[PDB]
Write an enzyme that holds these catalytic residues in place. Sequence first.
Site, short mmCIF file in Angstrom:
data_model
loop_
_atom_site.label_atom_id
_atom_site.label_comp_id
_atom_site.label_asym_id
_atom_site.label_seq_id
_atom_site.Cartn_x
_atom_site.Cartn_y
_atom_site.Cartn_z
N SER A 267 0.78 -1.21 0.00
CA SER A 267 0.00 0.00 0.00
C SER A 267 0.83 1.28 0.00
O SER A 267 0.29 2.34 -0.30
CB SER A 267 -0.91 0.07 1.23
N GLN B 60 -10.80 -4.95 -0.44
CA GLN B 60 -10.40 -5.65 -1.66
C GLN B 60 -11.62 -5.87 -2.56
O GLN B 60 -12.76 -5.90 -2.10
CB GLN B 60 -9.75 -7.03 -1.34
N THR C 272 2.06 2.77 5.70
CA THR C 272 2.42 1.36 5.80
C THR C 272 2.05 0.61 4.50
O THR C 272 1.23 1.12 3.72
CB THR C 272 1.58 0.67 6.90
N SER D 224 1.91 -3.68 2.83
CA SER D 224 2.24 -5.06 2.89
C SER D 224 1.70 -5.86 1.70
O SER D 224 0.75 -5.40 1.07
CB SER D 224 1.63 -5.67 4.16
N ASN E 82 5.98 -10.03 5.74
CA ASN E 82 4.90 -9.17 6.20
C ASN E 82 4.80 -9.33 7.73
O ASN E 82 4.02 -10.14 8.23
CB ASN E 82 3.59 -9.62 5.55
C1 LIG Z 1 -1.85 -2.10 1.44
O1 LIG Z 1 -0.80 -2.74 2.13
C2 LIG Z 1 -3.06 -3.04 1.60
N1 LIG Z 1 -2.68 -4.18 0.75
C3 LIG Z 1 -2.21 -4.09 -0.49
O2 LIG Z 1 -2.17 -3.04 -1.10
C4 LIG Z 1 -1.65 -5.38 -1.11
C5 LIG Z 1 -2.53 -6.60 -0.85
C6 LIG Z 1 -2.52 -7.51 0.20
C7 LIG Z 1 -3.53 -8.48 0.06
C8 LIG Z 1 -4.28 -8.28 -1.08
S1 LIG Z 1 -3.79 -6.89 -2.02
O3 LIG Z 1 -4.17 -2.35 0.96
C9 LIG Z 1 -5.45 -2.98 0.76
C10 LIG Z 1 -3.39 -3.65 3.03
N2 LIG Z 1 -4.14 -4.80 2.55
C11 LIG Z 1 -4.76 -5.30 3.55
C12 LIG Z 1 -5.46 -6.60 3.41
O4 LIG Z 1 -4.86 -7.65 3.74
O5 LIG Z 1 -6.64 -6.64 2.98
C13 LIG Z 1 -4.89 -4.67 4.93
C14 LIG Z 1 -5.75 -5.22 5.82
C15 LIG Z 1 -4.10 -3.45 5.32
S2 LIG Z 1 -4.17 -2.37 3.91
#
Ligand SMILES: *C(=O)[C@](NC(=O)Cc1cccs1)(OC)[C@@H]1N=C(C(=O)O)C(=C)CS1
Length: 362
Positions: free
Chosen positions: A65, A121, A316, A318, A343
């Site tokens: 992100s 998502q 942040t 991940s 992560n």
């Molecule tokens: C940004 O870290 C976050 N995730 C992503 O951009 C990359 C992905 C990880 C799993 C699927 S895409 O933005 C949505 C974080 N993603 C999650 C998540 O696991 O749904 C978070 C809960 C923190 S924000």
Amino acid sequence: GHMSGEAPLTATVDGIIQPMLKAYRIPGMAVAVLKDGKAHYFNYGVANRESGQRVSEQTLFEIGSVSKTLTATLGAYAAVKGGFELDDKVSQHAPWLKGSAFDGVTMAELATYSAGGLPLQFPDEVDSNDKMQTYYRSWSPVYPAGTHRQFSNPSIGLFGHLAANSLGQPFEQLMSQTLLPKLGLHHTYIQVPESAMANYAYGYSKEDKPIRATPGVLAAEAYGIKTGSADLLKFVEANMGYQGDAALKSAIALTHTGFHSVGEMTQGLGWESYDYPVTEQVLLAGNSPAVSFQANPVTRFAVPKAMGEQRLYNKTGSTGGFGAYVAFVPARGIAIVMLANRNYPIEARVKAAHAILSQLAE
Ligand SMILES: *C(=O)[C@](NC(=O)Cc1cccs1)(OC)[C@@H]1N=C(C(=O)O)C(=C)CS1
Ligand code: NA
Ligand SMILES: [Zn+2]
Ligand SMILES: [Zn+2]
Ligand SMILES: [Zn+2]
Ligand SMILES: [Zn+2]
Ligand SMILES: [Zn+2]
Ligand SMILES: [Zn+2]
């Protein structure tokens, strides 16, 4: 310690990072900091556990992100170039969204996660462009526009997509052929070229296996970037004070505008910010699941406001195998980038970053 210099700085960074890498079994980490605007680099461990290739400031890590700060910068650039205005309705920039809920959502709300409960998502079977369009055309708001913040890939993803479309170019092209070269980020990618693949780390998943991010709907916009500590610090330096292309300067400044707050965190384009100095407890709370990743009612700003230099900006990010954190304070000349190929918990990222930032501030 309340003294500055190469000796206390290295004692602090190594002393904070080394125990953390052991505690969370992090295979490798690249760290870079600014103090008084000058850069220092610390590398630990391995990019690839099987080969033993060492991490350096060139190793490419997925930043998850944190990519959204670059997406937001690209969106700001397109607004500065006249492709759209932040108060525009989203359907003014997507004819296929006329007669949908996006008639009642602004570009700014989409960029700042306040459109009305777009989810974290995409649902699992929204996995093509055609399905994506149907998804947004059929979407039913959970909350009234502008009232609630819910961090969301669909939300910032569509913002980046439409912003690029407003200039008549695909997002990946605009990023790679314009935004990244103008920022001087020459080792930063959405699609890593074959020539750079030797520098791309493997991520290590929660099951301890090698992993990397896969293609997905609006993946480029939401989590597309692979970069190293040196390039990411350069992007930070452009946020600390950028002199050059007036349009890019304005765009970066626009990412420092605050639109609403949740508790002590103020949401901008990409960057989230705090007062500075800021306590560890506040920085942890602002980055905690309750605030960062679940729905919250916002404190609305009368008008969006430039937040200025006396702020801690952060993000942040991940992916399945990677964990990144960036924070910087323009007025103070201090920053930290921490990129890892596990992560590992955001709480650990924030505690370590706060401790290092406190030494940088001396
Ligand atoms: C940004 O870290 C976050 N995730 C992503 O951009 C990359 C992905 C990880 C799993 C699927 S895409 O933005 C949505 C974080 N993603 C999650 C998540 O696991 O749904 C978070 C809960 C923190 S924000
Ligand atoms: Na796109
Ligand atoms: Zn002190
Ligand atoms: Zn140094
Ligand atoms: Zn499918
Ligand atoms: Zn489109
Ligand atoms: Zn280049
Ligand atoms: Zn600023």
